[PDB]
Amino acid sequence: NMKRYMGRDAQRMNILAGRIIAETVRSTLGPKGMDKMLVDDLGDVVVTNDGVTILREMSVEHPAAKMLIEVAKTQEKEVGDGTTTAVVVAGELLRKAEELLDQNVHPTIVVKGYQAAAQKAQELLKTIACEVGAQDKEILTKIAMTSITGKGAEKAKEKLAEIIVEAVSAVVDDEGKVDKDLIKIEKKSGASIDDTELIKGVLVDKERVSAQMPKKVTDAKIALLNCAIEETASEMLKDMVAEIKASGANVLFCQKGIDDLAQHYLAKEGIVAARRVKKSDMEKLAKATGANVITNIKDLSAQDLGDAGLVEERKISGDSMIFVEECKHPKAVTMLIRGTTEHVIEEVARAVDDAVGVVGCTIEDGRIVSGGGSTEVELSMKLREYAEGISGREQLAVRAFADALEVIPRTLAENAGLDAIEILVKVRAAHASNGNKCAGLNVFTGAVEDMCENGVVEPLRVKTQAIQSAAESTEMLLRIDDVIAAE
Amino acid sequence: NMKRYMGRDAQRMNILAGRIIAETVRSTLGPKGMDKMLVDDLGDVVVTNDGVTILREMSVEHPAAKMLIEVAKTQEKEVGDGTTTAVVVAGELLRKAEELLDQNVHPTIVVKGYQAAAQKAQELLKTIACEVGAQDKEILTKIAMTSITGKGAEKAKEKLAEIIVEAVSAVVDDEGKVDKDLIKIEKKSGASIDDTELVLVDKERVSAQMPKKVTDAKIALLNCAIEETASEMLKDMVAEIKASGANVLFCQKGIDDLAQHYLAKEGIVAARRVKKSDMEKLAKATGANVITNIKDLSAQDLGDAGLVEERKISGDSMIFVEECKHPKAVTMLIRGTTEHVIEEVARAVDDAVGVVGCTIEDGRIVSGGGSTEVELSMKLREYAEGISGREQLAVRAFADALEVIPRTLAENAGLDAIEILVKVRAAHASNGNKCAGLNVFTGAVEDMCENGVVEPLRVKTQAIQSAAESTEMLLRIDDVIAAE
Amino acid sequence: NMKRYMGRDAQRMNILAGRIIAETVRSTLGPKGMDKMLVDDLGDVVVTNDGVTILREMSVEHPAAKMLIEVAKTQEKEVGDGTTTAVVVAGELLRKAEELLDQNVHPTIVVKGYQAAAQKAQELLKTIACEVGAQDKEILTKIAMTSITGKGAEKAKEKLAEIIVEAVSAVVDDEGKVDKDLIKIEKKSGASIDDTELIKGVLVDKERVSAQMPKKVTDAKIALLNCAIEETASEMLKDMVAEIKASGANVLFCQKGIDDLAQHYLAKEGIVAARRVKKSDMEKLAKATGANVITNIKDLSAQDLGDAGLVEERKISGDSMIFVEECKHPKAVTMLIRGTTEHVIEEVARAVDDAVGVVGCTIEDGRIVSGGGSTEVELSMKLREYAEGISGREQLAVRAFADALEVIPRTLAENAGLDAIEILVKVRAAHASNGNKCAGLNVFTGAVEDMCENGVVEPLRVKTQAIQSAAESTEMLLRIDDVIAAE
Amino acid sequence: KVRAAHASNGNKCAGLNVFTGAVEDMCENGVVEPLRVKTQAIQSAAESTEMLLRIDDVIAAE
Numbered sequence A, C: 001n002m003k004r005y006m007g008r009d010a011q012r013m014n015i016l017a018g019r020i021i022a023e024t025v026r027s028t029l030g031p032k033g034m035d036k037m038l039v040d041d042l043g044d045v046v047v048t049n050d051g052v053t054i055l056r057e058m059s060v061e062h063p064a065a066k067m068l069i070e071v072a073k074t075q076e077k078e079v080g081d082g083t084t085t086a087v088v089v090a091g092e093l094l095r096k097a098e099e100l101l102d103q104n105v106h107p108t109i110v111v112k113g114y115q116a117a118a119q120k121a122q123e124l125l126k127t128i129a130c131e132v133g134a135q136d137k138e139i140l141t142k143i144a145m146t147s148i149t150g151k152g153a154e155k156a157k158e159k160l161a162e163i164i165v166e167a168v169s170a171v172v173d174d175e176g177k178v179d180k181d182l183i184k185i186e187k188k189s190g191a192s193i194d195d196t197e198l199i200k201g202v203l204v205d206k207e208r209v210s211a212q213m214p215k216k217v218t219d220a221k222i223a224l225l226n227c228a229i230e231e232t233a234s235e236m237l238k239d240m241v242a243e244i245k246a247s248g249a250n251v252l253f254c255q256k257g258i259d260d261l262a263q264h265y266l267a268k269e270g271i272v273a274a275r276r277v278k279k280s281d282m283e284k285l286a287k288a289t290g291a292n293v294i295t296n297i298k299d300l301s302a303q304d305l306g307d308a309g310l311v312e313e314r315k316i317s318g319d320s321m322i323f324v325e326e327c328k329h330p331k332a333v334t335m336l337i338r339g340t341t342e343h344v345i346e347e348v349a350r351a352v353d354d355a356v357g358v359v360g361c362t363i364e365d366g367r368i369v370s371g372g373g374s375t376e377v378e379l380s381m382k383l384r385e386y387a388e389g390i391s392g393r394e395q396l397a398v399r400a401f402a403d404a405l406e407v408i409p410r411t412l413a414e415n416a417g418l419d420a421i422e423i424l425v426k427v428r429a430a431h432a433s434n435g436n437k438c439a440g441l442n443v444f445t446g447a448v449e450d451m452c453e454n455g456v457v458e459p460l461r462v463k464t465q466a467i468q469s470a471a472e473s474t475e476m477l478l479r480i481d482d483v484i485a486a487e
Numbered sequence B: 001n002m003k004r005y006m007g008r009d010a011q012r013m014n015i016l017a018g019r020i021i022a023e024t025v026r027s028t029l030g031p032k033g034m035d036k037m038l039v040d041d042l043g044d045v046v047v048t049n050d051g052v053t054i055l056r057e058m059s060v061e062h063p064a065a066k067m068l069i070e071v072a073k074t075q076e077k078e079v080g081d082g083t084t085t086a087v088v089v090a091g092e093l094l095r096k097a098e099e100l101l102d103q104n105v106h107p108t109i110v111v112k113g114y115q116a117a118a119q120k121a122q123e124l125l126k127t128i129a130c131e132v133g134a135q136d137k138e139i140l141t142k143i144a145m146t147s148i149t150g151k152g153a154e155k156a157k158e159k160l161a162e163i164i165v166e167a168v169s170a171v172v173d174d175e176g177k178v179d180k181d182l183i184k185i186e187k188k189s190g191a192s193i194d195d196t197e198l199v200l201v202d203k204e205r206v207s208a209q210m211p212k213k214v215t216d217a218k219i220a221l222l223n224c225a226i227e228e229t230a231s232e233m234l235k236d237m238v239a240e241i242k243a244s245g246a247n248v249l250f251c252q253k254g255i256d257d258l259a260q261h262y263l264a265k266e267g268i269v270a271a272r273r274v275k276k277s278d279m280e281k282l283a284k285a286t287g288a289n290v291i292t293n294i295k296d297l298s299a300q301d302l303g304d305a306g307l308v309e310e311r312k313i314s315g316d317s318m319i320f321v322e323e324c325k326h327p328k329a330v331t332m333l334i335r336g337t338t339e340h341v342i343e344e345v346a347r348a349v350d351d352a353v354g355v356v357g358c359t360i361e362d363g364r365i366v367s368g369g370g371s372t373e374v375e376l377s378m379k380l381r382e383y384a385e386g387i388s389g390r391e392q393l394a395v396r397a398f399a400d401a402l403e404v405i406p407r408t409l410a411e412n413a414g415l416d417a418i419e420i421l422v423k424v425r426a427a428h429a430s431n432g433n434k435c436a437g438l439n440v441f442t443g444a445v446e447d448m449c450e451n452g453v454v455e456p457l458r459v460k461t462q463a464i465q466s467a468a469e470s471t472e473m474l475l476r477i478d479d480v481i482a483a484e
Numbered sequence D: 001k002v003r004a005a006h007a008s009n010g011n012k013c014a015g016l017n018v019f020t021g022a023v024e025d026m027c028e029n030g031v032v033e034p035l036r037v038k039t040q041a042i043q044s045a046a047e048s049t050e051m052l053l054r055i056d057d058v059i060a061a062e
């Protein structure tokens, strides 16, 4: 009771389960990659190329397959981009492992070489990585450009990448990490894609509570009140209005409802107010302007008020919304991501998400590597010669580890249309002795080109995390010989 | 009615059932051993290498298999480490037994030799065991290091083993046993593993009026409610706690708002609605009695802690009941990144505390890595030579079964289990080494005493006696009656 | 309607049913005998070697098999030990019977010889039985030693047998039967087996109610109160305590609760008291010391108080318990049977049960016979020569009765490992002419030895009851030719 | 073991001795074979396999 496989029947059951889900996302990789449509129990339709979003929301029930969905889940959590690459490598590491298992090379000699090779792969990637001075904006634009590319060449326009770099370099808390939560993302409509602007303000989908109040305010000290400013019919709000005036706040964002009596008194003072702003927008206003959300009107302080640079009720795209925005030295930045349809906007929103990560990782690390399966060949040849200096049966585990690294450049040709056998030799011979280190496959051109001059560059964290997450997972999976599954 | 197997069909049914569960945990043994994932009815997932935790929580229904889950259950209860080794030996003793049963050698002649060999095995392990002075801290560090190793080489760091020895040598009540309950285990978060420094109740104080940290506190554990109305009916209840002389009060039920003022008026600190699991922890750690009546609360029913403090550790404000100085009680703040890591680092110390505590109580250690298994095997085969009768073959099969552990160590290492089994066997003859064993990382046969691979004598002596007595009883069954 | 077997199909149906349950308990016999595990409908597990406990609690449904579970049931009721032997003999008497039935020798000629042989077997056992008169303690120790042996050689220790004889010889109501109910059995834990003590006494699992009270008293008068000595806060117990002092009882056993006020006053007088003693222990204290159970304090008498020799709160085996010991002439004796685990204690409790029976039977009867299948050979050869002096077809029934007696010494070799065909000749030839009468098989030695010098002896009632109970049952079963089973 | 013992320079004459077990120098052991044993065996096997890899249709009568 109830389900058990013995030795050889258990090892092959776990390896096959990891490989079968790897082939599901193997076509998606590359600029010439494919998309997947997922229809669940509800009949809800969603089409995505992103490898991590496929594995999470589809029906998977095999115990061994569920353990491999933790690799991509920790890939999107740590890096973001390279979720597809982290899964495919893990599948090839299982394919090269079972070839050794059939020859009676023991799993612990395999795990001995696999760990030692991954330990050397991390210290070899550091030497081949290029340094991009944290504020080297011309390279940071290329890194951002490489991130937008892959999701679409038409999405990759010169002006878009220049906007993203300016936002990330500003939110750096010296010295000197990058917080991704400091950048606010707004999804609004209107004929755009090109009208996407780099913004200084939360965009609140609301108006002014009274038409008597000013349409625009200068240098607004913003009081974020969570508490209700409410009443009857006997001016019981003149205290509540004066308490806000005591702090010196000319703009008031209220999360709850503002009563009609208070609307007149706040308009008489000259204070602009808004009733029932979304809880999501209130948390944005607190971090962007530097404000504190206060849940009591009697204790509202002047040092709990935020500072904005432009507050205006513009009738943009027809809808009259409150522009907060605009800042001399902003530690928080808002991105007004706009497009024709909401489904386009959400895609342009997720495209920036990857572009923010890579530039943020470059500032924190220093470090980029050549993409398009370029550094995968350099690391592969450097670990095979590293295997030569290893005596024993653990050498063959390092050899299988290095031969598994050539799967990414091989799959990039599989989805491109070109032969995966011919190019795999062309790039391999173009890495020997000295040059290039930066030689890779360009899927549009066809011939092997220098990736440094093309503008195809990825952060070092995209490659270092993907290898370590796949190695640690495959090492654990090769340590299972008995499976106990109840029910 | 309802199920019965006859003679040969009953003996083979019981032997096969014991062997089939032995192979389930046979791959887990060794530094390069395998792990097991168990998915039960609820869909709850847990991965473990520990042999005893697998057999307890998995679905086992065969009558003969359930009897062998009492060997490892009494292995973790008596020793702790060596739960895997105790099961594998019992499986090999059944394999070597049925080889004799098919040759028409009577089971009582088998049980005659098996007991006589186990009686000799216990009086042969005593010589090959090395004496470890109770406060020889350089060897005690090695014993602790050998305990952490096996669960992970990355877990085995030089600084960790030095911390453990200092705690165990301090809690020794002269003279001169070691109480494992004196060491308090705390599970907290924070970027640690290395920040691990030499009861934690998830609650606060019932009133902000009450103070925060005493020295030499007396703790009254009350199960009964301290409750009321609006006419100071708690002034008796508060004074009855003051009558005993307890400045700290842990209440399992609810404390009423009127009593909160009066307890804080005296200076007594109270906590309302502490979990039943935590109340049983506080009673055994401090030495307290759980009292279910406020009228009979005595001063000798109170526990004694060293340091009680409401620290805001990891954000959460919790009651730190530990502590001391020149200390008969020690607290271990076991910390790590995720809670699942912390619990594993907590269980790794559990084995490390046991071995050092056993070394102080006994004196005694034996070489690990399948080293003393070969020495005992060759000494019992020559012991079999001086036995006349058919009971000799039972002693020979008993001694040949002892070479299973060194054989399985090579099975999971990668090296040949047939080649090394000869190399070590030849390196034990005449005199040297007695301490010769297999090092899975090096590959070649090395001296285990110089490598630092040492285990307490109780790990080997208990495992043999628990496996021998179980297999002796299992070979005494010829008819099985299973109703329903 | 509904079930019936005709003649030959009915006789063979009943004989086979008696033999199949006999083989179930056939392997349990002997010092190297096997144990049986019984799993019922509830899933309750219990392992036992004792033959009578197996047959009672296991699922048996055949009509002929249920009638044979009355032999062992009346064996444990009359004797105690020899429940296994009584069943195996009955099975062999059915095997030797159907060999005669297939040869067309009529059942009434079979029952004619079977009764006549059993009538002679009883008068031949009396001549071969050895006399050890009722208080011959050196032989009584051997009889007790022989009873403990069979359940375990490690259980058979010199000191244990000496303790049992002293208890049985004391509870004899002159003149001069032995009541087995007079010996109280207590099952308590602690590192023992050797710490098992003879109590003319009760061992109460409790302490003193107040630490102010004395710890050891000589010639103590014990008042057994069943009523509660209780109160408020106005010394309403000074009457109750003085009423205890009015009788003259320095020791006080209370079944209910003693109030805290009374605890001080009883300690002031010097009277030792205990609160909430188990009802089982209170009935023990009343019969051992010679006390009365007392419920309503107001009437306390000196002639209801029991008399003990030594009352001491010893911290034996860690636990501090009240040692009520040292009676002078006890007609009732308590045995504090102790061991490590409760499952060990229960086995050491049942081992004494057989040891009490045999010594009690020796005092009531006078006799012992040699065990280990020794007297079974002597009676077998003496009945074959008795068969020679019988003319007719009833002779073959006596011959089959005598040939069936050699099953016990044969089965003793079966479970020993030695050949059951070779030894069966060795002992048979060693009984001819004169010697030995006390020659039998020692399973540990292997060779045939004199059982009288070895110390292997069993009471005559163990053999005489087992033969008569098996003979009368088999005689009735051979008288059935039609079976009517409804439903 | 032998593959790593051929790198850079030495040995060229390193091989496996089946009786000893460990890798030994074959020149000092006395294990030597003529060049024609190796040169003929390669050329005879290469020319045969080259011809066999040139067949895509098989006609077998009877």
Ligand SMILES: Nc1ncnc2c1ncn2[C@@H]1O[C@H](COP(=O)(O)OP(=O)(O)OP(O)(O)=S)[C@@H](O)[C@H]1O
Residues within 6 Å of the ligand: A028, A029, A030, A031, A033, A049, A050, A051, A052, A080, A081, A082, A083, A084, A085, A086, A149, A150, A151, A370, A371, A372, A373, A441, A442, A443, A444, A456, A458
């Ligand atoms: N123009 C290009 N020419 C060649 N390779 C490219 C080009 N643009 C991107 N790549 C490479 O294609 C890979 C990215 O392919 P994708 O299909 O986006 O998968 P992924 O980035 O691994 O995972 P996602 O994006 O999270 S789904 C990286 O290895 C890039 O270096």
Ligand SMILES: Nc1ncnc2c1ncn2[C@@H]1O[C@H](COP(=O)(O)OP(=O)(O)OP(O)(O)=S)[C@@H](O)[C@H]1O
Residues within 6 Å of the ligand: B028, B029, B030, B031, B033, B049, B050, B051, B080, B081, B082, B083, B084, B085, B086, B146, B149, B150, B151, B367, B368, B369, B370, B438, B439, B440, B453, B454, B455
């Ligand atoms: N470095 C080492 N070299 C060789 N043998 C070792 C080494 N460290 C430990 N051992 C041996 O490995 C065995 C311990 O293996 P484990 O897999 O931990 O199983 P166990 O201790 O029998 O049971 P657990 O720990 O309770 S699961 C002992 O027989 C040790 O003596």
Ligand SMILES: Nc1ncnc2c1ncn2[C@@H]1O[C@H](COP(=O)(O)OP(=O)(O)OP(O)(O)=S)[C@@H](O)[C@H]1O
Residues within 6 Å of the ligand: C028, C029, C030, C031, C033, C049, C050, C051, C052, C080, C081, C082, C083, C084, C085, C086, C149, C150, C151, C370, C371, C372, C373, C441, C442, C443, C456, C458
């Ligand atoms: N040391 C011994 N050597 C030879 N025979 C022995 C020895 N001890 C006991 N016996 C015999 O073994 C038989 C007792 O075996 P047991 O298995 O205890 O069965 P039983 O007494 O018939 O039934 P139980 O005890 O009620 S289950 C008797 O016939 C004894 O005379």
